[PDB]
Design a protein around this ligand. Sequence first.
Ligand code: HEC
Ligand code: HEM
Ligand code: HEM
Ligand code: HEM
Ligand code: HEM
Ligand code: A1D6K
Lengths: 62, 378, 54, 142, 106, 79, 49, 49, 49, 49
Amino acid sequence: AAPTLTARLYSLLFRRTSTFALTIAVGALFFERAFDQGADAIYEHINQGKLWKHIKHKYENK
Amino acid sequence: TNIRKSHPLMKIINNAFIDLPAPSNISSWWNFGSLLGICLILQILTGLFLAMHYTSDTTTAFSSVTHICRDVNYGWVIRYLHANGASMFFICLFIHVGRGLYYGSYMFLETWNIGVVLLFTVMATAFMGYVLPWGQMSFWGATVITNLLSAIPYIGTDLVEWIWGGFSVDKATLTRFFAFHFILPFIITALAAVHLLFLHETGSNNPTGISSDMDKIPFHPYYTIKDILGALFMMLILLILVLFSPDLLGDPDNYTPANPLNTPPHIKPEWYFLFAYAILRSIPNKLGGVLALVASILILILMPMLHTSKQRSMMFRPLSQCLFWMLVADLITLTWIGGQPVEHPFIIIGQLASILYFLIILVLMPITSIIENNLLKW
Amino acid sequence: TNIRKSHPLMKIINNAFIDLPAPSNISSWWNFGSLLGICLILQILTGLFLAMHY
Amino acid sequence: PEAARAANNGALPPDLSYIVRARHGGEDYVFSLLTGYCEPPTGVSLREGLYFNPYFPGQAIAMAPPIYNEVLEFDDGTPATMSQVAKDVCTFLRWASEPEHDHRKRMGLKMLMMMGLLLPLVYAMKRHKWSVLKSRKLAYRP
Amino acid sequence: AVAASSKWLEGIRKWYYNAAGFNKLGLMRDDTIYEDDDVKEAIRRLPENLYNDRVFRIKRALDLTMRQQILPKEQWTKYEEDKFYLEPYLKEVIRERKEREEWAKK
Amino acid sequence: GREFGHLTRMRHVITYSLSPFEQRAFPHYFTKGIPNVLRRTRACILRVAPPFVVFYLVYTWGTQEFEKSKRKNPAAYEN
Amino acid sequence: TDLELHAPSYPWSHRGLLSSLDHTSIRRGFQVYKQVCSSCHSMDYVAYR
Amino acid sequence: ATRKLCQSFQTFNICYAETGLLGAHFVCDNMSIDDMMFFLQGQWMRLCT
Amino acid sequence: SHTDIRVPDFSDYRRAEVLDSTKSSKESSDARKGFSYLITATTTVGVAY
Amino acid sequence: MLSRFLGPRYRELARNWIPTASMWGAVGAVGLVWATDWRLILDWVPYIN
Ligand code: HEC
Ligand code: HEM
Ligand code: HEM
Ligand code: HEM
Ligand code: HEM
Ligand SMILES: COC(=O)N(OC)c1ccccc1COc1ccn(-c2ccc(Cl)cc2)n1
């Protein structure tokens, strides 16, 4: 009866609910700068060649 | 020695939100009472911003609002949070009233009567906020109220002159409409604490209409996590209407400025007043039309007296369920008629639907409950 | 059946202002707590006027 | 406005900084009126200052047609025909009415991605507490 | 009180009993009554075995509505097996209220 | 005076419960849930829906008779 | 006063839900207001800023 | 004893060959169950730390 | 009698690692009580919005 | 069914209470015009001008 990989770190960090009181602060990363994969790479792909920083090399260093 | 049962301030919170006995079969229709408390708080922390940068005069009102969407930083998001946040308040209010009408919650007499006062106060507040931006719909919508407000046979001509700042359309008109709009949302916040103190004497009703004292659960954690999930689904719908179509609920003719320049192509208010504008417009008398406007909201107070069924709710009453949904389809008709011009098919329809709204509540509903009483052999 | 001892809103007022036990030798120096509540209400119904025209 | 309508035979042409937010067509109405001129049909006897535009309220705008082929030539080189003239000025006057257009839609994309995380996770937390009541059994032994 | 419609009006009574659905939750008709002051005095006067039967039937129906479920069709309450256990106790409570009211005006 | 030890009188009733960590939070979801939400739809469809059908027929008759009272004039348009 | 003609739906390049405006077609359309008009229309709410 | 919260309590250690039960039993009146469960669980947590 | 009282069967609700009634659930409990549990933890990194 | 007004003993309900109210339906014509700044009863008497 080998279990699955849901014993994540339950015996290591999550038992004594020390994590739960401060996940607004401590467990808070991986979801602003790791989501450069998110909206900005999607939004500029639907609007390729239409934003200002696409038509930009045409009008500096002239 | 349990601190949440003995501290003088903590034990008020514990009896109200934590250890409160609640029925176990409460549905999602009981979510909209805490949603109304979220919408009222949100309209206060957003009306802070707008009254800060504001000037209310006949010469600068239309431009004081256009200054915020372009020049004032984070002003386009906060203005359309406020205009759509008031449409969100009114859809959470009509669901809330129709719940208590369907399940017989008006038998809590003191809680129901403070509710009818709360329905009048938010309706009069939002009327005095749409007059503030001063466009075509702000002018011609305000100047049909005072035609029926000067129709009061003795005191009416000095009543409208006392609230118009002193004469007519002028600088100080929007100093008494704006005064009656800054301060009325705070009488609502005090009337809501009294509204819940009367409900605490009995606890909540439930969808079966039978008392549930043998099957109570604590409010925490079962309905604290269910009210948080329902509030998150409300913020998703509100931010979709703000960030993807912020002018869907609105009228373009209120971007044309206010002046007695020219008669507009139409006159219509926001969507949550279209049922009331359709009723008074189908009465060709400015005194009979102002009486049936107040009689369309204060008719809710007669609902405890008109009850003739032996059961409380409508869960086991199939003939009464048909009449409840005929009343909802009658209010959809009046919302459509109230945005139509006054022409041939929209006068015979708009005045027969004004009759059927009063015929269902007063005559058809008390007779049908008696017929269902005889069929169950009591 | 006494309505000021059994109504849910009236019994809060009765315990706070009417039937409240108070010492009998309280002086005039104990008057200034309700005077502070009069001065705070007055500064609210007068700051209404000034922020209107401002 | 005294000298305005005297220059235009009793009509003041309005301001345009909110003109597509103030009509029931958006920027589709401004385009369809700039390029929709016709001649007055049989029976429509119009007065001194009326040119027959069928996309106008009252059919009788006091507006001679303002644009035609090459009233202008652009800075980078673009054939300046009449529809191309009107299509570009109707991409103007919409940015003017709504200068928050592209910021409104990019902020709406991060909203839909964050509430695609928060909502299935609050729902399964609610599902965890309520499973005690959903699985309970009752028995009556008098 | 018509002898020609003796069976026809009992067909409409049996139809309305099934259109209403307290029998699908295992309830009797007197379980569903609205409890005003005359009903609350009649519950206090019930014998101890009829009181305990009513309390369990209401708790089982509240638990079914929480789950949005109903009972199997062989466990539904039949029309000609529904016992009006509360009706003799309620007619006596109301007769006593109407006696104290004729006395207060005469 | 509405607290948990003082509510009502109850005799001879037994309840059994499981811990939330001992059960799966998602049991039969499409096996039970889809047949359940379909007979709930069938039980309420004859009460709710026929009022909203009559609103649809009045709306279509009201917008179509508005146009052919106005400027739609094929044959009643003579001397 | 009889009927009215409503404008059709043109497939603009900003019509979609996640669509931006074309920032070359605003530059070309500013000069249709600047040098072909402002002989009748003010635009009193937009600046050169 | 100070608040007159119960009639009695006891702690037990029941052992079998591979498992067992480790806990407590108490007797009280109908308005004292919530306070006695609160104080007992607070003593288990005060021994874990 | 009270010895006629037994718990009804809960097999169609249990997690898939405790259906066996003979294994003593030593390591199939701490590696089990984690299913809806970073569900609760990755919720509160999403509340940082 | 509000027939509590219709009784043969409480007809003296209204006979002990209306001798209070001999002016009380017209105190608005005595007392409110003290603050209306109208001339409702100010023409009745040469008491006031
Ligand atoms: C021939 C002078 C003239 C020219 C040049 C002109 N207009 Fe007009 N237009 C008018 C007049 C006059 C009115 C107002 C007519 C009235 O109010 O009866 C008007 C009205 C309008 C309206 C309102 C139409 C309506 O339905 O109310 C719009 C929009 C408009 N003009 C846009 C433009 C644009 C864009 C340009 C630049 C391509 C332009 N106009 C150039 C004369 C002109
Ligand atoms: C600002 C307006 C309002 C607020 C903040 C508010 C708030 C609440 C809350 C929090 C509840 C308890 C939870 C619930 O059942 O939803 C409630 C219940 C109730 N409300 Fe309101 N409400 C408002 C308006 C109204 C109106 C307009 C009415 C009726 C005309 C009303 C009548 C009732 C009734 C009868 C109940 C008890 C329903 C039951 O338990 O079945 N309320 N309200
Ligand atoms: C129950 C709460 C409220 C409701 C229903 C409400 C409703 C409205 C409405 C309908 C408008 C018109 C918006 C538009 O037409 O564009 C508006 C704007 C306004 N509100 Fe409120 N409001 C509420 C709270 C407040 C508060 C708390 C304040 C002041 C602190 C306030 C002050 C204003 C002002 C000054 C405006 C004009 C600004 C503008 O038009 O954008 N309102 N509100
Ligand atoms: C807005 C400010 C205040 C208001 C409305 C207020 C109001 C009151 C009232 C009504 C009383 C009871 C009657 C009395 O004994 O006078 C009272 C008592 C008291 N106040 Fe204040 N007060 C305020 C500020 C303060 C301050 C600044 C302090 C101390 C730093 C304070 C400390 C006390 C104490 C200790 C008592 C009880 C005194 C006794 O019974 O001997 N209060 N207050
Ligand atoms: C605790 C209550 C208050 C205190 C102690 C207080 C104190 C003051 C003071 C010292 C001034 C300056 C007057 C002068 O120098 O001529 C003033 C005026 C002013 N206050 Fe207040 N105030 C209170 C309440 C309020 C309220 C409730 C409002 C707004 C609703 C408000 C808004 C203003 C404004 C706008 C002025 C304008 C300056 C003037 O008209 O003289 N204040 N108040
Ligand atoms: C958002 O504001 C509007 O819709 N307003 O007012 C500026 C408007 C605009 C144009 C035309 C008409 C109106 C108002 O139409 C109605 C019809 C009924 N009420 C009403 C108002 C208060 C109360 Cl207590 C009860 C009923 N108002």
